[PDB]
Design a protein around this ligand. Structure first.
Ligand SMILES: O=C(/C=C/c1ccc(Cl)c(Cl)c1)N[C@@H]1[C@@H](O)[C@H](O)[C@@H](CO)O[C@@H]1O
Ligand SMILES: O=C(/C=C/c1ccc(Cl)c(Cl)c1)N[C@@H]1[C@@H](O)[C@H](O)[C@@H](CO)O[C@@H]1O
Ligand SMILES: O=P(O)(O)OC[C@H]1O[C@@H](O)[C@H](O)[C@@H](O)[C@@H]1O
Length: 867
């Protein structure tokens, strides 16, 4: 009965759920304004970057050091951690110009009274009460004054240090106890909170890509007038009386420092109005601060706390009724309940942000909490929890409590900062072996040159790993070439048959792709060319060509010995094919025999060319400056036009010949060994042909994905990735496809596509893992594009010297899936060529018609020469 009058009188201090949703929405707008780059400097809620980028792992370990500067205690803590199950961190502390740092800073040996640690150079966690502006984990300056984190160091005569808000320290120690804790919260002398934000949302820090803890400083929510319609006569007066009038308006209606004073002032207003005490106001009731937050807890805590109201009201010298002790009780509830409901509105907004960032239909999140009002007040926690869960029904939230706070939380942030830095240099020492200097890439260029000579030399051509094989392709297309030409493209991902229909005064192009069943690729050679010619027939019919008599160019991309344009002998099947009775055989004969067994059409097989050569001719039809061809794909190879005088395996010195380099075998004689890593060695030794195609295995095919998953497995074993947990998929050779490198490195911001892939190889991965995985794919694919570039530099610069030129303008026909679908690799190769062959001006061109079109052109050119 007396309550209902207080309830009615304090009516504006009892806030409905509807107005708490209004408030939380308002605080989200305040949230975005402080994160935004234009709005920040005018934002009331500053949304400060913490530079804490990871919550605790569970694996942290070490001896750590730290100090609480809050000024109440001025304590200095100590802690040690270990990665075993029991999570207790051993904690021991005792409380406490240029002379100004060194005053009690003498305790470096004085807090060694326990472990006498002054011989141990040791990391330092640092928590700092006053306000600052920090640009890094270690850096800051006070506004209420130059440097700090660096200035406390020159007072040295050992440390590694970071500086953190007490709300972040709270989140971090609750994080080591529960790994789901993304929010710190303090309700105490003051009130603030921090949470983990996505780096794409933090404009004030460059990044994209990652999470950072944001120190909201919500104490200042409302300093611009956004809370005025819920603020109160009593709030205005607490503000005007404050040491900081105008600032911290939300903190003042929440924090413990102002709650006693807020109910006092309410008593005074009611006494003066005859509603309490019979208007008899003692002297002490008018003295500021005598009704204290401590008292609000006592009145509300106990069985009969209506007596302890009476006990306190008389400590202030009054004559309370019982109906007076009842009113002071409910005035206490209304103040502390409004405080609790207000932290629930602004948490409701933070939890709604994290839910959005995350993508989960129900947020599962853990709030680390601390501070006088939360822990000691009997009912504040129950009302905060109950009120949050009502404002976010799609929550599942759980709160935790940290004994340490600003003390051990500053140590725990040093444990995570140390862990990260330690695992980083570990990963970086590895990745550095795949990072090649300018000088190194010139040496690669130089070594490719002598290997090119070695193979062109008839003396050394037998031992030489880069064979420099003659292609018997000497003649560009010339003016009039007429007629229909069949071509074949075999050995790529796509086997296809082509009819290029060439007019003069105009190349008409037609193709079709056919599958080769694994059973046929792995069958007998009869079955394989029977199948190929059954596709030629299905195509002739598809074209209404039926049995017409057509010449045939043939792109066959396997290591052959060519004795002439129409004769080449297969050395070894590669890629998918193992078909019997083929290796060691003329490939044109095997094809011709399969055409006769079909007994349908007459085909004249004029030429067999490597895909490099076919690609160079395709691109040269458009661009007459194209003297080179390059594949980066299932495999890597290249060809240029050499001088007949330099091709000793073919008699005569007049003119040009294209030479298939087989450059993938560069390094089969050892010449790359001192640029090769353990992961190269391992990929080589577990491959199908150990010791063969070493350069190919650094720059292309499946081999790139294998280098990645060899690195990722090396990292995981060392606990440097995925928190040490190995997937079974990840253990499988070939599982990490080279197209993942393109997808992972094309990915940005949330890195969702990287995670999708890591899921596929079923791995339990954080968003920081995705960043590390993307780092690895970028190193590997850059070493690939730089190596390919160092080879292609030697190629083009040799063409330049052969011709005496001071400057060479060349075009390089390129093809292969890795070159055209990877985001950076064409870019980085071109840069490497321009960097390593300054005297050459190299265009690259991307065929789009495939190497078949050049097979058909090489055929047409070979006809006119005989016609
Ligand atoms: O002390 C402050 C704010 C100081 C400040 C900053 C800028 C200006 Cl312009 C002014 Cl007038 C004051 N905030 C504290 C939080 O850092 C802390 O997390 C929380 C719990 O300890 O207490 C307070 O809310
Ligand atoms: O596959 C190979 C060669 C492999 C090879 C050679 C010799 C031996 Cl002894 C052994 Cl074990 C394997 N060469 C291909 C080139 O012909 C093709 O131009 C390029 C692009 O398709 O892919 C490959 O590099
Ligand atoms: O090796 P990949 O990724 O299939 O790319 C190489 C092939 O690419 C094709 O587009 C060309 O037409 C072929 O001549 C070539 O062999």
């Amino acid at each position: 009965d007396q309550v209902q009058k207080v309830d009615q009188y304090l009516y504006h201090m009892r806030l409905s759920d509807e107005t708490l949703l209004e408030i939380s929405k308002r605080f989200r707008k305040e949230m975005e304004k402080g994160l935004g780059a234009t709005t920040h400097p005018t934002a009331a809620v500053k949304m400060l970057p913490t530079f804490v980028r990871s919550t605790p792992d569970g694996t942290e370990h070490g001896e750590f050091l730290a100090l609480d500067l809050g000024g109440t205690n001025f304590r200095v803590l100590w802690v040690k951690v270990t990665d075993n199950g029991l999570q207790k961190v051993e904690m021991e502390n005792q409380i406490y110009g240029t002379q100004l740092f060194d005053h009690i800073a003498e305790c470096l040996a004085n807090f060694m009274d326990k472990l006498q640690i002054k011989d141990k150079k040791l990391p330092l966690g640092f928590t700092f009460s006053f306000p600052c502006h920090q640009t890094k984990l270690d850096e800051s300056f006070l506004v209420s004054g130059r440097d700090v984190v660096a200035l406390i160091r020159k007072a040295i005569q050992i440390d590694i240090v970071a500086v953190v808000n007490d709300t972040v320290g709270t989140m971090m120690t609750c994080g080591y106890d529960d790994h789901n804790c993304e929010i710190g919260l303090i309700v105490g002398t003051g009130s603030n909170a921090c949470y983990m934000e996505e780096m794409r949302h933090i404009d004030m820090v460059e990044g994209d890509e990652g999470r950072m803890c944001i120190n909201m400083e919500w104490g200042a929510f409302g300093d611009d007038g956004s809370l005025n319609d819920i603020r109160t006569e009593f709030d205005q007066e607490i503000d005007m009386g404050s040491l900081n009038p105008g600032k911290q308006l939300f903190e003042k209606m929440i924090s413990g420092m102002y709650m006693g004073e807020l109910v006092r002032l309410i008593l005074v207003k009611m006494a003066k109005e005859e509603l309490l005490f019979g208007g008899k106001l003692s002297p002490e009731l008018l003295n500021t601060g005598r009704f204290e937050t401590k008292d609000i807890s006592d009145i509300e805590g106990e069985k009969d706390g209506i007596r302890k109201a009476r006990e306190v009201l008389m400590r202030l010298g009054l004559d309370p009724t019982q109906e007076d002790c009842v009113a002071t009780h409910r005035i206490c509830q209304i103040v502390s309940t409004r405080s609790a409901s207000l932290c629930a509105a602004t948490l409701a907004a933070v939890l709604q942000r994290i839910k959005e960032n995350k993508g989960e239909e129900r947020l599962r999140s853990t709030i680390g909490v601390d501070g006088s009002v939360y822990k000691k007040h009997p009912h504040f926690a129950k009302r905060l929890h109950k009120t949050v869960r009502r404002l976010v029904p799609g929550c599942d939230v759980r709160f935790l409590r940290s004994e340490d706070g600003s003390g051990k939380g500053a140590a725990m942030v040093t444990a995570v900062a140390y862990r990260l830095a330690d695992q980083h240099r570990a990963r970086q020492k590895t990745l550095e072996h795949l990072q090649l200097s300018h000088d190194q890439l010139l040496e690669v260029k130089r070594r490719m040159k002598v290997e090119m000579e070695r193979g062109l030399s008839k003396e050394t051509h037998a031992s030489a790993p880069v064979k420099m094989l003659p292609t018997y392709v000497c003649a560009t297309p010339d003016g009039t070439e007429k007629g229909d030409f069949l071509a074949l493209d075999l050995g790529g991902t796509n086997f296809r048959v082509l009819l290029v229909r060439v007019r003069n005064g105009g190349v008409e192009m037609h193709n079709k792709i056919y599958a080769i069943p694994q059973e046929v690729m792995h069958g007998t050679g009869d079955e394989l060319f029977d199948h190929i010619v059954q596709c030629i027939a299905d195509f002739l019919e598809y074209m209404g060509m039926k049995g017409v008599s057509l010449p045939l160019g043939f792109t066959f991309s396997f290591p052959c010995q060519q004795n002439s344009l129409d004769e080449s002998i297969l050395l070894k099947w590669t890629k998918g094919f193992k078909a019997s009775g083929c290796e060691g055989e003329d490939v044109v004969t095997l094809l011709k025999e399969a055409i006769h067994r079909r007994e349908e059409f007459d085909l004249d097989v004029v030429a067999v060319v490597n895909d490099t050569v076919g690609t160079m001719m395709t691109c040269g039809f458009e661009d007459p400056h194209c003297e080179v061809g390059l594949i980066v794909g299932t495999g890597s190879n290249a060809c240029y036009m050499e001088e007949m005088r330099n091709v000793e395996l073919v008699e005569g010195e007049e003119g040009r010949m294209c030479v298939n380099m087989e450059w993938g075998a560069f390094g089969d004689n050892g010449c790359l060994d001192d640029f090769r890593t353990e992961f190269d060695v391992a990929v080589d030794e577990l491959s199908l042909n150990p010791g063969k195609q070493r350069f190919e295995k650094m720059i292309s095919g499946m081999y790139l994905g294998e280098i990645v998953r060899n690195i990722l497995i090396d990292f995981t074993k060392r606990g440097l990735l995925f928190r040490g947990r190995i997937s079974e998929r990840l253990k499988t050779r070939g599982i990490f496809e080279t197209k993942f490198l393109s997808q992972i490195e094309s990915d940005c911001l949330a890195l969702l596509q990287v995670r999708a892939i890591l899921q596929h190889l079923g791995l339990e991965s954080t968003c920081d893992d995705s960043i590390i995985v993307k780092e690895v794919c970028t190193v590997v694919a850059r070493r690939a594009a730089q190596l390919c570039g160092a080879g292609m530099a030697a190629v083009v610069d040799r063409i330049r010297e052969n011709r005496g030129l001071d400057a060479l303008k060349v075009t390089v026909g390129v093809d292969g899936t890795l070159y055209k679908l990877h985001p950076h690799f064409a870019k980085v190769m071109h840069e490497t060529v321009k960097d390593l062959a300054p005297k050459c001006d190299v265009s690259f061109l991307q065929s789009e018609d495939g190497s078949g079109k050049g097979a058909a052109l090489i055929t047409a050119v070979a006809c006119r020469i005989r016609e």
